[PDB]
Design an enzyme around this catalytic site. Sequence first.
Site, PDB file in Angstrom:
ATOM      1  N   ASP A 120      43.159  55.357  67.998  1.00 11.74           N
ATOM      2  CA  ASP A 120      43.444  54.779  66.893  1.00 11.74           C
ATOM      3  C   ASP A 120      44.714  53.213  67.319  1.00 11.74           C
ATOM      4  O   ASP A 120      45.152  53.963  67.575  1.00 11.74           O
ATOM      5  CB  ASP A 120      44.380  55.584  66.016  1.00 11.74           C
ATOM      6  CG  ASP A 120      45.414  55.377  64.637  1.00 11.74           C
ATOM      7  OD1 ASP A 120      44.003  54.260  63.715  1.00 11.74           O
ATOM      8  OD2 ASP A 120      46.827  55.506  64.400  1.00 11.74           O
ATOM      9  N   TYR A 161      41.173  59.014  57.230  1.00 11.80           N
ATOM     10  CA  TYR A 161      40.440  59.607  58.431  1.00 11.80           C
ATOM     11  C   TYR A 161      39.505  60.028  57.218  1.00 11.80           C
ATOM     12  O   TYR A 161      38.173  59.962  58.184  1.00 11.80           O
ATOM     13  CB  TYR A 161      41.394  60.711  57.814  1.00 11.80           C
ATOM     14  CG  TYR A 161      42.763  60.817  58.971  1.00 11.80           C
ATOM     15  CD1 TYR A 161      43.350  60.074  59.727  1.00 11.80           C
ATOM     16  CD2 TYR A 161      43.527  61.939  59.106  1.00 11.80           C
ATOM     17  CE1 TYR A 161      43.950  59.902  60.429  1.00 11.80           C
ATOM     18  CE2 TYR A 161      44.655  62.076  60.112  1.00 11.80           C
ATOM     19  CZ  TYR A 161      44.556  60.986  60.628  1.00 11.80           C
ATOM     20  OH  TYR A 161      45.763  60.556  61.478  1.00 11.80           O
ATOM     21  N   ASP A 194      39.910  64.701  66.774  1.00 12.15           N
ATOM     22  CA  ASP A 194      41.225  64.452  66.058  1.00 12.15           C
ATOM     23  C   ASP A 194      40.402  63.673  64.533  1.00 12.15           C
ATOM     24  O   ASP A 194      39.256  62.162  64.998  1.00 12.15           O
ATOM     25  CB  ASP A 194      42.460  63.692  66.550  1.00 12.15           C
ATOM     26  CG  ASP A 194      43.533  64.378  66.887  1.00 12.15           C
ATOM     27  OD1 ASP A 194      42.799  65.684  65.842  1.00 12.15           O
ATOM     28  OD2 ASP A 194      43.812  64.344  67.139  1.00 12.15           O
ATOM     29  N   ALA A 195      41.121  63.135  64.168  1.00 16.45           N
ATOM     30  CA  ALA A 195      40.273  62.543  62.590  1.00 16.45           C
ATOM     31  C   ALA A 195      40.631  61.359  62.756  1.00 16.45           C
ATOM     32  O   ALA A 195      40.345  60.422  62.272  1.00 16.45           O
ATOM     33  CB  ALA A 195      40.576  62.703  61.320  1.00 16.45           C
ATOM     34  N   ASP A 196      41.967  60.624  63.457  1.00 15.92           N
ATOM     35  CA  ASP A 196      42.182  59.290  63.676  1.00 15.92           C
ATOM     36  C   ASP A 196      42.105  58.517  64.342  1.00 15.92           C
ATOM     37  O   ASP A 196      42.030  57.540  65.190  1.00 15.92           O
ATOM     38  CB  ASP A 196      43.911  59.174  63.971  1.00 15.92           C
ATOM     39  CG  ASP A 196      44.460  59.852  65.402  1.00 15.92           C
ATOM     40  OD1 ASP A 196      43.872  60.978  66.130  1.00 15.92           O
ATOM     41  OD2 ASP A 196      45.385  59.587  66.092  1.00 15.92           O
ATOM     42  N   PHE A 242      43.684  70.542  56.813  1.00 13.77           N
ATOM     43  CA  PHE A 242      44.713  71.356  56.237  1.00 13.77           C
ATOM     44  C   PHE A 242      45.410  70.380  54.850  1.00 13.77           C
ATOM     45  O   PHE A 242      45.917  70.235  56.141  1.00 13.77           O
ATOM     46  CB  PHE A 242      44.715  72.349  57.275  1.00 13.77           C
ATOM     47  CG  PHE A 242      44.077  72.949  57.912  1.00 13.77           C
ATOM     48  CD1 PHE A 242      42.827  73.300  58.073  1.00 13.77           C
ATOM     49  CD2 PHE A 242      44.493  74.681  58.041  1.00 13.77           C
ATOM     50  CE1 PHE A 242      41.908  74.245  58.273  1.00 13.77           C
ATOM     51  CE2 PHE A 242      43.886  75.325  59.160  1.00 13.77           C
ATOM     52  CZ  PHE A 242      42.689  75.333  58.992  1.00 13.77           C
ATOM     53  N   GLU A 281      45.765  67.384  75.684  1.00  9.55           N
ATOM     54  CA  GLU A 281      46.196  67.390  74.367  1.00  9.55           C
ATOM     55  C   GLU A 281      44.848  68.564  73.773  1.00  9.55           C
ATOM     56  O   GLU A 281      43.871  68.452  74.112  1.00  9.55           O
ATOM     57  CB  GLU A 281      46.298  65.992  73.758  1.00  9.55           C
ATOM     58  CG  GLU A 281      47.223  65.346  73.893  1.00  9.55           C
ATOM     59  CD  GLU A 281      48.393  65.486  72.434  1.00  9.55           C
ATOM     60  OE1 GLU A 281      47.911  66.315  72.312  1.00  9.55           O
ATOM     61  OE2 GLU A 281      49.459  65.079  73.054  1.00  9.55           O
ATOM     62  N   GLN A 327      38.666  68.422  61.407  1.00  6.59           N
ATOM     63  CA  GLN A 327      39.590  69.479  60.592  1.00  6.59           C
ATOM     64  C   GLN A 327      41.095  68.806  59.434  1.00  6.59           C
ATOM     65  O   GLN A 327      41.502  67.902  60.119  1.00  6.59           O
ATOM     66  CB  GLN A 327      40.792  70.074  61.538  1.00  6.59           C
ATOM     67  CG  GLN A 327      41.663  71.467  60.686  1.00  6.59           C
ATOM     68  CD  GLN A 327      42.350  72.357  62.038  1.00  6.59           C
ATOM     69  OE1 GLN A 327      42.447  71.697  63.236  1.00  6.59           O
ATOM     70  NE2 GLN A 327      42.616  73.738  61.788  1.00  6.59           N
TER      71      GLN A 327
END
Length: 306
Positions: free
Chosen positions: A300, A50, A201-203, A28, A233, A26
């Site tokens: 991360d 990311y 999550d992109a991290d 945004f 989470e 995602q």
Amino acid sequence: SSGSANFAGVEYPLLPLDQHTPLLFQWFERNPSRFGENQIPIINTQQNPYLNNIINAAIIEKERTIGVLVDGNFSAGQKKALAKLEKQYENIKVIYNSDLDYSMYDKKLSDIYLENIAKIEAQPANVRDEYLLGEIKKSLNEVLKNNPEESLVSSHDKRLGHVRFDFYRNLFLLKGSNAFLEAGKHGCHHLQPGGGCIYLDADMLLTGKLGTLYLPDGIAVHVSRKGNSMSLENGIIAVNRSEHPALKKGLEIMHSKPYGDPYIDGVCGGLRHYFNCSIRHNYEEFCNFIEFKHEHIFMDTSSLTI
């Protein structure tokens, strides 16, 4: 038959998520102008790599459809750079959030507030949340004075930061694999209607293929550990099918609770209600039961210091 997990004296079969279940990222973007007019409008610094993490996942998982759900006021050149990314990596599909129809998950705010005003007013005076009743009546009054047709979608469409990301994340996962078909993504290999999805999550860095996951009733979420604490989470959400009844439970809480949070109620509330992690149950036991675990998912490192 293919595995079993136990929570609160109930057995849950481990349901498989095949190696074709799509991945979902995602992005945004509030301020796309911070990127070049011809750059992929996704953050890609050494602090937040990311775009690199998304590519590295697409490189590892060659057969698997990789979704990137995007939103924001992108320039014509930034959309072409996103269109070019889908060309350099066949399995990457860029989906614009505006191209999906979420109206079947929506509800009018005036309906939610009236239901709760009636529910609270039925209660005797000695148990009534008098502060909450006043606040709801206040929220209803501002809706009737400013935007009487305001809904969960239109109200969340105006919010800033994570609460709007989290809101659409839940609704996309309820569509599951169907969302790629609805968006008109071509060449989605083995992507089935009614199919599931894996949000990341992109991290987070994928360092190897996930293969087939086995999750209790086909759902698992990220459990973060900070100091000596753990917490449910929404950084990872894996569902084996569309309209997963635990996320459906999360939406039903959004439809009944006056100030429902997509994270606390849509994900944590939905999961807890679905598996009966009541207030009298061990939260730590539920975390270990529902936790998404895989050797090839890496947390991360850029965050960290001495």
